[PDB]
């Protein structure tokens, strides 16, 4: 899948 | 370039860290050459004329880089006003403290002049929570190969004679694991004074992390004029390290 959320 | 009337319902950005890890190892297992080429590509839909601070853990040793033209050079990190759409922020290169996602351990046993006994083991070396994917291992055969028999527990393998390689392919494989393949290479006769110099075994893989250990700390968006602030922007990041030239001598 795309990305993971910034943190 | 970037016009002034830019307004978006969802103010999103996507950060791509694209790394290409290159490695030349001995059959013993000593690194003979290794570097990482990298670039950071931004795909963003933000309203206005944003001021963007990009922050990483420069910790890691970055060995050079070229920027895009809207970068305020002066940690000292990177501030910039990004074009709408998609553009490449920075482009760096690394040689120290590199994660080598796979070890390739080759083993070759001559058998008279008829057979060649070959065993090749790949050792994944990263968080087992993480999956490498698009894994290919290339094993060259000699030219006087009459035929090839192979076995492998994971993935698939054919002998491609047009290419004089056994190509072993593995859809996915988790960190800290092992897979091995085994071939019997049936040989024709040839000019015996001319021995066979063993071309390296090469690998291709893809991994959800940067093998240079670069991480992204912050990307703070600041809009003076318009009534959105930093904690309003949807931010996303992925790392996509791929094999460059990645060869174990044998």
Numbering used by the authors:
A (entry chain B): 610 to 616
B (entry chain A): 161 to 218, 240 to 255, 260 to 435
The authors write:
An IVT IRS2 fragment (residues 520–888) containing seven putative YXXΦ motifs also bound to GST-AP2M1, and mutations of four such YXXΦ motifs (Y649A/Y671A/Y734A/Y758A) greatly reduced IRS2 binding to AP2M1. These results suggest that IRS1 and IRS2 directly bind to AP2M1 through multiple YXXΦ motifs. Thus, IRS1/2 bind to AP2 through canonical YXXΦ motifs in vitro and in mammalian cells, and promote insulin-activated IR endocytosis.
We next determined the crystal structure of AP2M1 (residues 160–435) bound to the serine-phosphorylated YXXΦS motif from IRS1 (pS-IRS1). The overall structure of the AP2M1–pS-IRS1 complex was similar to those of previously determined structures of AP2M1 bound to YXXΦ motifs. AP2M1 contained two interlinked β-sandwich subdomains: subdomain 1 (β1–6 and 17–19) and subdomain 2 (β7–16). Isothermal titration calorimetry (ITC) measurements confirmed that the phospho-serine IRS1 peptide (pS-IRS1) indeed bound to AP2M1 with higher affinity (Kd = 280 nM), as compared to the unphosphorylated peptide (Kd = 2.03 µM). We did not observe well-defined electron density for pS616 in IRS1, despite its ability to enhance the IRS1–AP2 interaction. pS616 is located in the vicinity of a positively charged patch on AP2M1 formed by residues K405, H416, and K420, suggesting that the phospho-serine might engage in favorable electrostatic interactions with this basic patch. The YXXΦS motifs containing phospho-serine and unphosphorylated tyrosine are optimal ligands for AP2.
